[PDB]
């Protein structure tokens, strides 16, 4: 097996230290020499069987440069994959140990894509688990076209419960423990355990106190493991009624891809409103202690794929149009960049759509690439 | 029993008419449908199997439009690879018959690259007889580029470069264009019409004589098509070829830890620029010199055509063919010609840049090269 170690450097600069079993290089160099001997006519000898010693003195080095170049690349890609690292540039190889008969050791220095989440957009967009194509999207369009409506029901998984709450320890209200019209989506696990798990069953108008202890891994210093009380008031309980998934719900879009795009245009349009909302809420949900997960929008896999296909194209360019190499890279490598791409696109798209701003699709896309890949 | 026909329209417009057997579609619609009721559950039935018509009434028209979209793209690419077509832009599909249970029929209209013919550079670059290893190959190439010829007391033989002066005439009449001076005849290169060399072979410097020969029934000279003639040769000077030694030292400056392949490639281009300039200058002098059957040319390492092809294959991928997985199966001959031009135009601007140490954006020069090579 081949070995690799990853080093982080200044900036988005990483270095890979790959080692390759000597056998690989040595076996291949031998073979090719045997080939050259068998298929090259040398002055003074008949095709095939010529002093091996001779062919080695004429192509020994040369063949080693090629076997070497092939081995580095093949293992650079294999490392990248195994190390789940998405290069944002071409790698610069360096020979550490290329001695004949000895294990191959070389370095692969290069740049990667930044990891820091976008300001105010940290983990704001996510992909469903894993429905297997234009199905999950019809569903996404279904939920986006869904409307929340009040119901005389109680708070249970699925329902959205608007609540007001003010936390306190010994009758003393700590900072950021008071929230009005907070929308708690039962089942979303967005609050410190014990919270939600004690509002379930309550209906509109009820006021009550729940005891909740903050987790050890809790961020706030002054609340870490403190026992607390939250005075809750349930403002209302809504249910989401999803429209039907019938034929007239899909005839609105054209035929073939034109249709499969008219629909993507629509899903995108809604995500523009959903992200705007998600962001506003994020503001209002800052400082609100008890929260242990920021809100988020769900992006159909079909839409993340469109971005991953772009990332692959770009990766192929940075590898000299080596398309097969780009295909070999597993999807999860670009998953992150894709999400950043989708969000920046929705950000810009919302401004453009709202004021009917006319801008060349190509320029916008260039900027999205720049802003997303930061 | 699928049917695919190509129809040439006006100019660079082409149209694919594709028919897909209903069963190909209905099945695909089925597989996806089956694959839905066996992966996700809806509010109504167990996390397991559901009504045939349920999943179908819910995802019928949708899954189908999805499959149709996916299918047109795939057949367009297969149709293009089969027909050896290189689209200049994304195709425009138009459904012709999409009715359920019926055969899928659709057209794909688009344009193809105009057939660019670089003036004075027609077939000037040849790829070592195709249709190995990058370093090994370009070393054999660097070697020949360094070879030099020097006069020797030898007779004209295969491999020898015999400078000569000849003047052909049919019947006492020295026909037009049959006059040449100091023509480097590389024995064995088969550059002249059959029989020309076959009669000079053996002679040496000084020697002035005459020989016969008969033009090919298919020679471009409407006045020489077959008529036999006579050239008054004159072996000016015989030269021999001396290639450098191919050993450990001849390649050190190219070691993985020494410039590497990039240094070597740079060296080969550096040499080729010169050869090309010479080849172009030699192109002219030989124009209208009847007797010469093949236009001169320079040899390019496939390693360098490959670099160009990769770039072009990736570019075809973006234009049409969507994703990279699709470009990964496009055949090489689809881009052989455009690659050769990229190399050529690349040496044209290269020589001008190196000679005057002109500094310019490597990315801009490429764009320019790309454009001149495709001329679209």
Q: What is the CATH number of the domain that holds B369?
A: 1.10.3120.10
* Domain end point (choices A215, A243, A271): A243
State whether A72 and A22 are in the same domain. Answer: yes
Q: Structure tokens of B76?
A: 């367009």
Give CA–CA dist A143/A132, Å, rounded.
17
CA separation, residue B209 to residues B49, B160, B184, B232, B235 (Å):
96, 19, 17, 6, 9
DSSP 8-state secondary structure symbol assigned to residue B108: E
Min Cα distance B121 → chain A (Å) is 26
- Of A236, A237, A230, A231, the residue nearest A290 (C-alpha): A230
Sheet containing B3-8: order of strands: B3-8, B13-20, B104-111, B92-97
State whether B360 and B307 are in the same domain. Answer: yes
Q: Which residue of A33, A39, A51, A61 is the best one to mutate when testing the B interface, meaning the one whose CB has the most B CBs within 10 A? A: A61
Min Cα distance A140 → chain B (Å) is 13
Counted residue by residue, chain A has a size of: 374
Q: Helix H segments across chain B?
A: 22-37, 52-82, 134-146, 260-285, 302-319, 324-327, 336-355, 362-374
State whether A84 and A195 are in the same domain. Answer: no
Q: Which residues does chain A have within 8 Å of residue B311's beta carbon, measured at their own beta carbons?
A: 320-321
Give CA–CA dist B180/B286, Å, rounded.
8
Give CA–CA dist A199/A229, Å, rounded.
13
Q: Structure tokens of B376?
A: 């679209």
Chain A residue whose CA is closest to B247: A58
State whether A77 and A163 are in the same domain. Answer: no
Strands B235-242 and A125-127: unpaired
- How wide is the angle at C-alpha A25 spanned by C-alphas B138 and A108, nearest 5°? 80
**Domain containing B11 — which CATH number?**
3.30.70.1050
CA separation, residue A204 to residues A186, A208, A236 (Å):
14, 12, 5
Name the residue with tokens 């290329």: A98
State whether B37 and B186 are in the same domain. Answer: no
State whether B83 and B229 are in the same domain. Answer: no
State whether B257 and B373 are in the same domain. Answer: yes
State whether A262 and A123 are in the same domain. Answer: yes
* Domain end point (choices B184, B214, B244): B244
- Of B64, B62, B61, B94, the residue nearest B76 (C-alpha): B94
Check: CB of residue A121 under 8 Å from CB of residue A343: yes
Q: Which residues does chain A have within 8 Å of residue B36's beta carbon, measured at their own beta carbons?
A: 131-132, 135
Domain that holds residue B160: 148-244
CB count in 10 Å sphere of residue A5:
11
State whether B172 and B267 are in the same domain. Answer: no
Strands B125-127 and A125-127: unpaired
Chain B residue whose CA is closest to A257: B69
- Of B255, B273, B271, the residue nearest B263 (C-alpha): B255
| Closest CB from B73, B314, B325 relative to A321 | B314
**A79 sits in which H/E element:** helix A52-82
Chain A residue whose CA is closest to B34: A132
CB count in 10 Å sphere of residue A22:
15
Chain B residue whose CA is closest to A246: B58
- Of A173, A176, A159, the residue nearest A285 (C-alpha): A176
**B40 sits in which H/E element:** none
* Domain end point (choices A97, A113, A129): A113
Give CA–CA dist A31/A239, Å, rounded.
70
Give CA–CA dist A52/A39, Å, rounded.
13
Q: Which residues does chain B have within 8 Å of residue A247's beta carbon, measured at their own beta carbons?
A: 57, 60-61
- Quick one: three-class SS letters along B121-145? CCCCEEECCCCCCHHHHHHHHHHHH
Q: Structure tokens of A357?
A: 């701003």
State whether B199 and B232 are in the same domain. Answer: yes
Name the residue with tokens 């609105």: A252
Gaps (C–N > 2.5 Å) in chain B: which residues precede them? 131
Q: Which residues does chain B have within 8 Å of residue A253's beta carbon, measured at their own beta carbons?
A: 65
Give CA–CA dist A346/A273, Å, rounded.
9
Q: Structure tokens of B127?
A: 């790829």
SS3 content of chain B, % helix, strand, coil (to 5): 40, 20, 40
Q: Structure tokens of A318?
A: 């940075």
| Secondary structure of residue A96 in the 3-state scheme | strand
Q: Structure tokens of B197?
A: 């060399």
Phi/psi at A129 (5° precision)? -45, -115
Helices B302-319 & B336-355, crossing angle to 10 degrees? 110
Q: Which residues does chain B have within 8 Å of residue A254's beta carbon, measured at their own beta carbons?
A: 65
CB count in 10 Å sphere of residue A246:
12
Give CA–CA dist A310/A305, Å, rounded.
9
Strands B298-300 and B125-127: parallel
| Number of domains into which chain A is organized | 3
CA separation, residue B46 to residues A130, A138, A157, B38, B51 (Å):
20, 21, 19, 11, 11
Give CA–CA dist A28/B226, Å, rounded.
54
Residue contact A61–B324, C-beta within 8 A: no
State whether A168 and A136 are in the same domain. Answer: no
Counted residue by residue, chain B has a size of: 376
State whether A103 and A54 are in the same domain. Answer: yes
Residue contact B324–A320, C-beta within 8 A: no
């Amino acid at each position: 097996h081949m070995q690799v170690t990853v080093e982080t450097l200044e900036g988005l600069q990483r270095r890979l230290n790959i080692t390759v079993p000597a056998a690989n290089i040595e076996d291949a160099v031998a073979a090719e020499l045997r080939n050259i001997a068998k298929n090259r006519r040398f002055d003074g000898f008949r095709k095939g069987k010529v002093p091996m010693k001779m062919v080695a003195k004429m192509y020994g080095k040369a063949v080693r440069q090629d076997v070497l170049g092939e081995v580095m690349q093949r293992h650079f890609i294999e490392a990248i994959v195994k190390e789940k690292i998405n290069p944002a540039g071409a790698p610069t190889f360096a020979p550490v140990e290329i001695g004949e008969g000895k294990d191959l050791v070389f370095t692969a220095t290069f740049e990667v894509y930044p990891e820091v989440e976008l300001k105010g957009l940290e983990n704001i967009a996510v992909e469903k688990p894993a429905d297997a194509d234009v199905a999950e999207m019809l569903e996404t369009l279904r939920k986006q076209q869904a409307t929340w409506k009040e119901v005389d029901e109680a708070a249970e998984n699925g329902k959205r419960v608007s609540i007001d709450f003010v936390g306190s320890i010994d009758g003393v209200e700590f900072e950021g423990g008071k929230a009005e019209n907070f929308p708690l989506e039962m089942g979303a696990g967005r609050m410190i355990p014990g919270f939600e798990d004690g509002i379930v069953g309550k209906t509109k108008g009820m006021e009550f106190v729940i005891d909740v202890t903050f987790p050890e891994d809790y961020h706030a210093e002054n609340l870490k493991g403190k026992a607390a009380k939250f005075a809750i008031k349930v403002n209302k309980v809504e249910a989401r009624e999803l429209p039907e998934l019938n034929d007239e719900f899909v005839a609105r879009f054209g035929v073939a891809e034109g249709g499969v795009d008219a629909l993507k245009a629509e899903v995108r349009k809604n995500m523009e409103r959903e992200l705007k909302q998600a962001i506003k809420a994020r503001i209002k949900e800052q400082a609100i202690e008890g929260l242990v997960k920021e809100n988020e929008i769900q992006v159909p896999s079909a839409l993340i794929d469109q971005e991953i296909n772009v990332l692959r194209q770009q990766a192929a360019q940075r590898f000299g149009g080596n398309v097969e190499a780009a295909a070999q890279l597993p999807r999860e490598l670009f998953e992150e960049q894709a999400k950043r791409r989708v969000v920046v696109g929705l950000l810009l798209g919302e401004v453009i759509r709202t004021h009917e701003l006319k801008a060349d699709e190509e320029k916008v896309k260039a900027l999205i690439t720049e802003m997303a890949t930061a």
